[PDB]
């Protein structure tokens, strides 16, 4: 099913009452307008001609989390659209906001403006440059630590979107100090808390070889050949594939990885009823031969 | 709340399952992937890297509605995504198929296709032309005709779509003889075809001087001034734009509009309690001085 509508004076209507002293009045043009920008590109890219971006960048100032959850839903939706529809939110001053809101004590905003920042960094280098300048790195670092597992996987996924850029993004994300944290994440025994930083940690090591060996002398080496012993077959894909990209590096990272006792752990994983583990395996273990 | 997924050697495999004799399986496949691309422009990315578009191609000339159904759902979603995307959906070569699925006694397929059709036509100059091309327009146009309320607004949507081009695209729909249609769908007592027809013709008449006269020869000017009698105030609004845009033309084309007996509705217009119905009204009476 799907209904078309046509824009429509409505739509400037409904942002100029984002300035409305009327605060209900306001509530309903901001659910009108996430509502709407929760649809195609075309949907996305009227709200911005109506000149939304403005209007919801400075609401996200309010002390009124009603008011400032809708705002931040509308922002990450607009930028869950094409690249230069994530650039219309940075070009309106989105950023600085977002990251400001990192410390919230508020997990409700805190998500939703990770989430937001997430859907930015999602698009080409450009967008994933400017969050980098806007400062979120040493932000998102630091939230690798937090307790608060749903926290934890928003900023693994920021993270890890930041890290599938070009090679000096993913400096960036080093330089930052990621590696240390997703390398003690490599400890838990939480399957699900492995999943996410194997994702974040397999984007790194997809670098270039200086960004690989940053990710050697972090100590992931050990910490992933534990895991190859992993009953949880997800864990086994994640392990392979992070490990099959520091292969693809240059003979010294391909090295480091024959000296991490890899051999024998592939080599049974090379026998596996799964096609994918047996594939990865298989190859991980050529390339370092 | 939000879910997030990387993919995926998954991706790959459920694409190759659409080659599969499994017809469950492959609908297990199909479905998953439509799921996908209605995500985010990431997650339609991620399909179409996968290289599902050749096989969602194929499918649609399959005898299995079933079956075909799903990858209309699934073409059409990706067509929602960003400019490039609709493209590749294109160079896929999914346009001679679709026209041809017009044709379809099916309401479902047809409507289906109408819908993926009208998403292709909402992208830029570059995609619009490529559906002209691939020779939608004759059977577009033939469906004006439509006795099918359902079958009628999703054409009508498509055209519009057409004719939001440039003012060559829009020619096309011209040439093609759309204006017949729309200047007769002008005299229905339904409220609700009228507003789709008028969203269509408006689109229309913001083309060239070329465009708006070829509209003032179809004779829609009698049409729309009989249209600014009418109770219902979405309707006033859409006839106001309409022949706002006609107005917006040379000294040729508003002539015509003060001699079609536009002024003393417009003037009463200009004393209205609707705000967009009293400004647009008092807009074109000024034009045409
Ligand atoms: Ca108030
Ligand atoms: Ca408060
Ligand atoms: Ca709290
Ligand atoms: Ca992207
Ligand atoms: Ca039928
Ligand atoms: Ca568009
Ligand atoms: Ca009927
Ligand atoms: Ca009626």
Chains 1, 2 share one sequence.
Do not use: F, Y
Not at 21 to 45: F, M, T, W, Y
Not at 75 to 88: D, F, K, P
Not at 164 to 174: K, L
Request: charged share 15%.
């Amino acid at each position: 099913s799907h209904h078309h509508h046509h824009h429509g004076s409505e739509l400037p209507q409904m942002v100029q009452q984002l300035n409305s002293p009327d605060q209900q009045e306001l509530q309903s043009a901001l659910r009108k307008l996430s509502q709407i920008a929760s649809g195609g590109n075309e949907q996305i890219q009227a709200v911005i001609d109506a000149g939304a971006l403005p209007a919801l960048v400075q609401l996200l100032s309010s002390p009124n989390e009603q008011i400032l959850q809708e705002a931040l839903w509308t922002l990450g939706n607009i930028a869950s659209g094409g690249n230069e529809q994530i650039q219309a939110v940075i070009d309106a001053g989105a950023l600085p906001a977002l990251v400001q809101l990192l410390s919230s004590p508020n997990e409700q905003i805190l998500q939703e403006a990770l989430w937001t920042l997430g859907n930015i960094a999602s698009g080409g280098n450009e967008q994933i440059q400017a969050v980098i300048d806007a400062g979120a790195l040493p932000a998102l670092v630091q939230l690798l630590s937090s307790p608060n597992e749903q926290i934890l996987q928003e900023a693994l996924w920021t993270l890890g979107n930041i890290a599938s850029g070009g090679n000096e993004q993913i400096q960036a994300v080093i330089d930052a100090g990621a590696l240390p944290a997703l390398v003690q994440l490599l400890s838990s025994p939480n399957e699900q808390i492995l999943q996410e930083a194997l994702w974040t940690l397999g984007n790194i090591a997809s670098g270039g070889n200086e960004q690989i060996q940053a990710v050697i002398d972090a100590g992931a080496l050990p910490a992933l050949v534990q895991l190859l012993s992993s009953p949880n077959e997800q864990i086994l894909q994640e392990a392979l594939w992070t490990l099959g990209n520091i292969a693809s590096g240059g003979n010294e990272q391909k090295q480091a990885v024959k000296e991490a006792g890899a051999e024998p752990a592939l080599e049974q994983l090379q026998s596996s009823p799964n096609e994918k583990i047996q594939k990865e395996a298989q190859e991980a273990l050529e390339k370092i031969q």
